[PDB]
Every structure is written in structure tokens, then in C-alpha cells.
Write an enzyme that holds these catalytic residues in place. Structure first.
Site, PDB file in Angstrom:
ATOM      1  N   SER A  45     -40.464  44.981   2.315  1.00 23.00           N
ATOM      2  CA  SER A  45     -40.005  45.332   3.647  1.00 23.00           C
ATOM      3  C   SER A  45     -38.707  46.106   3.411  1.00 23.00           C
ATOM      4  O   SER A  45     -38.145  46.044   2.323  1.00 23.00           O
ATOM      5  CB  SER A  45     -39.707  44.071   4.456  1.00 23.00           C
ATOM      6  OG  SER A  45     -39.119  44.393   5.706  1.00 23.00           O
ATOM      7  N   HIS A 103     -52.943  30.254  10.056  1.00 26.30           N
ATOM      8  CA  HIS A 103     -52.026  30.659   9.007  1.00 26.30           C
ATOM      9  C   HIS A 103     -52.719  30.509   7.654  1.00 26.30           C
ATOM     10  O   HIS A 103     -53.491  29.568   7.436  1.00 26.30           O
ATOM     11  CB  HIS A 103     -50.754  29.787   9.038  1.00 26.30           C
ATOM     12  CG  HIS A 103     -49.595  30.421   9.751  1.00 26.30           C
ATOM     13  ND1 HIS A 103     -49.594  30.666  11.105  1.00 26.30           N
ATOM     14  CD2 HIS A 103     -48.407  30.879   9.286  1.00 26.30           C
ATOM     15  CE1 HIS A 103     -48.459  31.247  11.448  1.00 26.30           C
ATOM     16  NE2 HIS A 103     -47.719  31.391  10.361  1.00 26.30           N
ATOM     17  N   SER A 121     -52.059  26.293  12.227  1.00 28.67           N
ATOM     18  CA  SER A 121     -51.946  25.945  10.820  1.00 28.67           C
ATOM     19  C   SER A 121     -53.296  25.512  10.258  1.00 28.67           C
ATOM     20  O   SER A 121     -54.116  24.931  10.968  1.00 28.67           O
ATOM     21  CB  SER A 121     -50.930  24.810  10.662  1.00 28.67           C
ATOM     22  OG  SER A 121     -51.023  24.208   9.390  1.00 28.67           O
TER      23      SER A 121
HETATM   24 ZN   LIG Z   1     -46.366  32.813  10.236  1.00 22.85          ZN
END
Ligand SMILES: [Zn+2]
Ligand SMILES: CCCCCCCCCCCCC/C=C/[C@@H](O)[C@@H](CO)NC(C)=O
Ligand SMILES: [Mg+2]
EC number: 3.5.1.23
Length: 643
Positions: free
Chosen positions: A105, A203, A249
Site C-alpha cells: 500500500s 473473513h 468470521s
Molecule cells: Zn477485515
């Protein structure tokens, strides 16, 4: 003839295998120390009948695709393929795996735990993405596109239920889960499945912050299982993309025990398996054939004080706040690593060179615009450059009756659902019947929560950078883009995305020098395999090596499991590579400048009983010559017994 043509391409984008902070967990200590499976860019080029109008979608086994990557691959595509590719028809998304090297990034905030910009990993990523697109277009073939969906209720759980239940409109998401998986399948002229893209929220954090091996995580395993274990057709490419997984999750129990597991690798495999199973079932149903035009819209939007119309807020006009991150609860943290950039600036030379986390007071205007957030870091006002993005990409692809949205952030279930319903409502008249929301696309601007969830300020809310109305702004941007598509008018003139390639710092050390073990030479075998093994046993071998940072071995491998026959005298044929689930490559510093390559292989059912040996490939740098040489070795042969 056929309505469309599609091309499926795949290229290696695996970064530095040792000593670079991993992306996702913001853990100062989680540095790469090897490879379990590689990271890949999977490109899908779609062409439309009469016109050759082209669209490109690339899903990457990465934590996300930052703006820097987006800007670079497009600059290369525009310069190399003028007139065919530009920001309008190229979408880059990520699986959001947390087990890949970071530093790709250009915004300090996302490079913090990595100690800065890691050029080698960054370039491997842009080059691999470009490569996957070139390979995909080279494989353009006539065919049909099919769309289908189903429900997966056993591969995820909401990690912020409290906030989720704050939403009044959650009919169909009462348990915090978005069970919907969408699949766009590609069928060739012979009616055979050539590839597919599966969309499902969760995720890719099955591999915890304690793992140091590079890995595509659960979505990557799903891709691999389909491509390597299931599909017999080659050139087969299966991508597992995200939609709105900001609060979803894969660890079904609450950290590192998903269903009943106790093990991250088992968890990674099982969650990937369940996603694969659903996608495979859905693809087989070929529920609804895709037909109609291809079209797209792209726009760089400057979020700085972006005007939000009253119809998307509470009835009154609003302007987005400049970026800020607030505190929230965990204890350790949670969905795996250390948290809200509580990387302590003590062992972080990069952080202190930036000037620390806090610097002076956030303007009083920022404090109230941010509403219930208790700001920890004012990233938008940082100097000379803000630590978080300000100009973001908004993109939509029309593929027949399908609209694919590329959103630069992590959207909670409801944050995405609302945008989906809103866009579907605006595109109805155009003939759109399915709105696929793909978060983690084109850039990364943290989290997006609904106004209600934001008010609770759980983790996702604290990381909803632009204030309580961030979700509304995105809904306004995508709706306005959708109406533009419906009316066939251009979208507003794009703002300029800041080019930060000029000022990137890096405090993470590279390779100074490599030396063999004392008295040894690179490639020497420190640990030979046992005389024989049975199927199901794990073969562990070790070599004297050099720092993998010297060479990514892109499109190559650090190891090969070789089969030399039942009598050991047949032409050697490799059966396993460092990309395979059954193998593992681990690197560790030994002595001052030596290092060890530990290679393991879990002999899988179906293995031809016979003689095998393991080969290692590495690279070592010499201090005096500053030269990087190829090194390697091969163990003696061992026997695989029928079992
Ligand atoms: Zn995340
Ligand atoms: C409070 C939250 C603490 C940790 C988690 O939010 C992070 C781990 O670094 N995980 C993700 C997926 O973002
Ligand atoms: Mg492997």
C-alpha cells in the site's frame, strides 16, 4: 454463435516468503517465515458478442488490493493495451486472506506493522496481476455464462452481533449471517465447466496471527481444491470472492476453533471445503443463464467532505468527515491479531519517523462530525500525507442481468445489503436482476458500517474512517452510478488519485548477506528422510539455504517432491510443489547469517507406492560480490509403502 467469450488466466503473486510483516493482523511480530501455498491472481476476461466490448475481473489471494496496486497495474494495462483497458473495465478484488506479506500500500496506516513499503512484494503483485490478465485474454473462447445462488449457513458467524442487531431492516439476517453465495460459471462451447467465480462473505482469517507461513487461507483452499483436486479439465480457474464480510468470521467458535476445530490448518481446509461444496453444487445447477449487454462505470471520488444528500441520511444534508480511527473493545484482539493500530512505536522505526500515532488535537469540527467515535488517531490530517486514502474508486460492471459492484472497503452484512437493495431498486428498469456486491475492490479504505452499527462503535464502527454517514455516502455513490448506467449517461468526471510512489519509506531490513552453515555449503541436506513412509505420514526434510527474500521464485518453487518409480529408476516426475496443500516450506535464521529450509510433505491418499526424493531450490546472496546465486539440493530417496 455464442453470446459471450471468456478467458481464464492465473498468475503467481506470492511475495517475500521471509521477514516481512504479514498483512491483515497489524502484528509487528507476524513476519513471513515460509510458504504453505502460494498466492494467485485469477483473471476473468469477458467479451460481448457483436462488439468485443471487454470487461476484466481479477480476484487476488491478498489481504486487499490497495490503491497503489490498482494505479500501477492500470498504468501498465493502459500503456501496453491502449484503447482496450482503462479504469472503466478493470476490477481488482481480494479474498482478504490475512496470511500474505504486506507493504504493498502507499498509505502509511496499512504499512505500519510491516515497517513501511516493501517494493519487492508490491511489484510481484502488480506484475502477477497484469500477467494473469494477459494469460486470460490469451485464452478467450466462446461460451455461455450462468448465474446461480444458494445458502451457506455453516461457514461463518457474525463477530459483532451486538451492532448487527441494531439494524431495524435485518429481515433474513437475524442470526448475523449473510448465507448467500452467488456463482457466475463459465461454460465452454462444449458445455463443459471452464471456471467460476464464487461470492460469499467471510473473513479469510482461518490462519491465525500466530501463523508465519504464506497462505491463501480458506478461500484460497477452496480455489485450490477445485482446480487441483477436483477439476480434470485444465486451464480451470475457480475464484472465491468476497461480498460484505466486514463483521463475518470463519472461526465458528470465536477465534481458533471454527466448527470444532482446534487447528488453524484443519479450520482453513474445512471452511474452504464448505465454500467449495456450495459453489460446486450451485454451478452444477446452472440456475439462470446470463444474457444481455456488458457495460461499466468507474469513478475516482474524493471523499473529503463529500456532500451526502438528505435522502441517504436522517433527512438533513451531511458531509463526510476526514478519516479517523477510534478505539473499541477486544481485550487481545479479535478475528485474530493485535488491534486498533496499537503497534507500539517503540520497536517501530517507521511509526516514529512518521511522528507517532497522535500529534496534537483533532479539530473540534472533526470530533463532532465523527459523532460517537472516540478518536484514537486522526489519520486524515496527518502530514505531509494522510495515513489513509481520500480519493476512492467506485465501480460497477454490468454483465447481462448481473451488476457487479467493486467497493474499496470492508462492508458489514447490513452495510452491503442496504447498498445492494438500493442499487437493485435503481437498476430494475434496466433489466438487472442480481446485484453482486464485491468488497475489497480496487482500493482499501478500512471498514463501512451502517449508521446504526456505527453508533455502537464496535470494531468495524471504530474503523469506519469517514464518520457515521460513510455507509450512506457509498450507497449514494453506487446508486448514482447505477442510475447513470440505467440512463446511459457518463458518470461524473473523476477526481485525481494521489500518486504516492515518490514518498515511500521502509525500515524493514532486506538481505545483508547469506552464509552456509559453518563447514557446509548451500544445498546441503541437514536432515535426510527416513528409509520409508506410509501414506498419511509426514515427511520432514531440511537444507542449508539462503534468504528467500533474495528471490520470490515467481512461477517456480522452493521445493519439489519427486517420484522416481517403484524401483527408483524411472524418469523423475514431480508430484508436489511449494503451492500444494500437502507441502510446507519453512525458513529460519540459524547462526548469524545462515538459514535453514525445512520442507515437509504429508503423503496423501492415492500416492503411488514407490521411491521419492525431495528437491530444494533457493537463492543466496554474497556480501563481497553482492551477487545472488541459485542454490539447492536433493535428499536421498525414500520409499512410500502401500498402506
Ligand atoms: Zn477485515
Ligand atoms: C478489536 C479487533 C482486534 C483485532 C481484529 O480486529 C483484527 C486483528 O488485527 N482482525 C481483523 C480481521 O481485522
Ligand atoms: Mg506448499
Amino acid at each position: 454463435d455464442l453470446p459471450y467469450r471468456f478467458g481464464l488466466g492465473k498468475a503467481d503473486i506470492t511475495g517475500e516468503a521471509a521477514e516481512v510483516g504479514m498483512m491483515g493482523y497489524s502484528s509487528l511480530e507476524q513476519k513471513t517465515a515460509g510458504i504453505h501455498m502460494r498466492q494467485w491472481a485469477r483473471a476473468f476476461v469477458i467479451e460481448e458478442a457483436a462488439s468485443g466490448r471487454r470487461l476484466v475481473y481479477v480476484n487476488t489471494d491478498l489481504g486487499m488490493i490497495f490503491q497503489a496496486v490498482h494505479l500501477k497495474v492500470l498504468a501498465r494495462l493502459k500503456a501496453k493495451y491502449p484503447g482496450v483497458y482503462d479504469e472503466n473495465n478493470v476490477m481488482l478484488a481480494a479474498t482478504h486472506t490475512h496470511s500474505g506479506p504486506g507493504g504493498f500500500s502507499h498509505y502509511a496506516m496499512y504499512n505500519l506493522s510491516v515497517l513501511g513499503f516493501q517494493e519487492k512484494t508490491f511489484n510481484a503483485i502488480v506484475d502477477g496481476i497484469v500477467r494473469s490478465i494477459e494469460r486470460a485474454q490469451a485464452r478467450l473462447q466462446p461460451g455461455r455464462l450462468f448465474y446461480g445462488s444458494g445458502e451457506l449457513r455453516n461457514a461463518s458467524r457474525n463477530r459483532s452481533l451486538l451492532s448487527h442487531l441494531k439494524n431495524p431492516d435485518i429481515a433474513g439476517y437475524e442470526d448475523g449471517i449473510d448465507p448467500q453465495m452467488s456463482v457466475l460459471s463459465f461454460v465452454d462451447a462444449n458445455g463443459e465447466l471452464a471456471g467460476a467465480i464464487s461470492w460469499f462473505p467471510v473473513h479469510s482469517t482461518s490462519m491465525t496471527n500466530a501463523n508465519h507461513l504464506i497462505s491463501p487461507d480458506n478461500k484460497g483452499y477452496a480455489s485450490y481444491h477445485w482446480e487441483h483436486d477436483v477439476s480434470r479439465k485444465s486451464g480451470f480457474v475457480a475464484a472465491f470472492a468476497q461480498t460484505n464480510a466486514g463483521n463475518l468470521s470463519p472461526n465458528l467458535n470465536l477465534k481458533p476453533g471454527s466448527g470444532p476445530f482446534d487447528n488453524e490448518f484443519d479450520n482453513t481446509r474445512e471452511i474452504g471445503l464448505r465454500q467449495f461444496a456450495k459453489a460446486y453444487e450451485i454451478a452444477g445447477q446452472a440456475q439462470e443463464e446470463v444474457l444481455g449487454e456488458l457495460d461499466s462505470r468507474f469513478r475516482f471520488v474524493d471523499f473529503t467532505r463529500l456532500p451526502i444528500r438528505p435522502e441517504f441520511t436522517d433527512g438533513q444534508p451531511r458531509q463526510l468527515c476526514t478519516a479517523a480511527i477510534g478505539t473499541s473493545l477486544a481485550a487481545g484482539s479479535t478475528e485474530d491479531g493485535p488491534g486498533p493500530l496499537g503497534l507500539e512505536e517503540g520497536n517501530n522505526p517507521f511509526l516514529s519517523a512518521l511522528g507517532g500515532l497522535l500529534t496534537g488535537v483533532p479539530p473540534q469540527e472533526l470530533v463532532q462530525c465523527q459523532a460517537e467515535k472516540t478518536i484514537l488517531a486522526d489519520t486524515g490530517n496527518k502530514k505531509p500525507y494522510p495515513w489513509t486514502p481520500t480519493v476512492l474508486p467506485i465501480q460497477m460492471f454490468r454483465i447481462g442481468q448481473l451488476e457487479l459492484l467493486g467497493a474499496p472497503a470492508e462492508f458489514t452484512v447490513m452495510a452491503g445489503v442496504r447498498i445492494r437493495r438500493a442499487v437493485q431498486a435503481a437498476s430494475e428498469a434496466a433489466g438487472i436482476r442480481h446485484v453482486v456486491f464485491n468488497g475489497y475492490a480496487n482500493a482499501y479504505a478500512s471498514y463501512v458500517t451502517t449508521r446504526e452499527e456505527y453508533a455502537a462503535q464496535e470494531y468495524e464502527g471504530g474503523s469506519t474512517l469517514y464518520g457515521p454517514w460513510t455507509q450512506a455516502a457509498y450507497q449514494q455513490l453506487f446508486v448514482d452510478m447505477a442510475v447513470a448506467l440505467r440512463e446511459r449517461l457518463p458518470v461524473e468526471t473523476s477526481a485525481i488519485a494521489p500518486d504516492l510512489s515518490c514518498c515511500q519509506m521502509n525500515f524493514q531490513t532486506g538481505v545483508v548477506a547469506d552464509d552456509p552453515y559453518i563447514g557446509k555449503s548451500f544445498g546441503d541436506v541437514l536432515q535426510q528422510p527416513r528409509e520409508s513412509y506410509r501414506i498419511g505420514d509426514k515427511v520432514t526434510v531440511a537444507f542449508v539455504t539462503g534468504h528467500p527474500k533474495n528471490d520470490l521464485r515467481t512461477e517456480k518453487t522452493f521445493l519439489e517432491v519427486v517420484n522416481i518409480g517403484k524401483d527408483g529408476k524411472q524418469t523423475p516426475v514431480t508430484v508436489a510443489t511449494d503451492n500444494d496443500w500437502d507441502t510446507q516450506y519453512r525458513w529460519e535464521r540459524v547462526g548469524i547469517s545462515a538459514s535453514k529450509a525445512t520442507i515437509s510433505w504429508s503423503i496423501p491418499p492415492g500416492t503411488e507406492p514407490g521411491h521419492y526424493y525431495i528437491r530444494h531450490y533457493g537463492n543466496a546472496k554474497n556480501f563481497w560480490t553482492q551477487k545472488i546465486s541459485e542454490i539447492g539440493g536433493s535428499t536421498r530417496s525414500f520409499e512410500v509403502l502401500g498402506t
